[PDB]
């Protein structure tokens, strides 16, 4: 549910889209997520590794 469980009622959202809001919140246009989603996911999985 992203940040929304802080504010209230924990609105569900698909994770790929809330990450693209995280990108949009740091001035990187949200298409950068949806285009590079496999790379970003693979980078995250490697970093947890």
């Amino acid at each position: 549910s992203g940040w929304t469980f802080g504010a209230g009622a924990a609105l569900q959202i698909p994770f790929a889209m809330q990450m693209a809001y995280r990108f949009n919140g740091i001035g990187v246009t949200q298409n950068v997520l949806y285009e590079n989603q496999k790379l970003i996911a693979n980078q995250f999985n490697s970093a947890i590794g």
């Binding site: 790929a16 949806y34 285009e35």
Partner: peptide, 20 residues
Amino acid sequence: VVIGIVNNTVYDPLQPELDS
């Protein structure tokens, strides 16, 4: 390139002017 994209028409507010 986009995962999970969907198909819909996107309206163009210029089109009815050129049409008219």
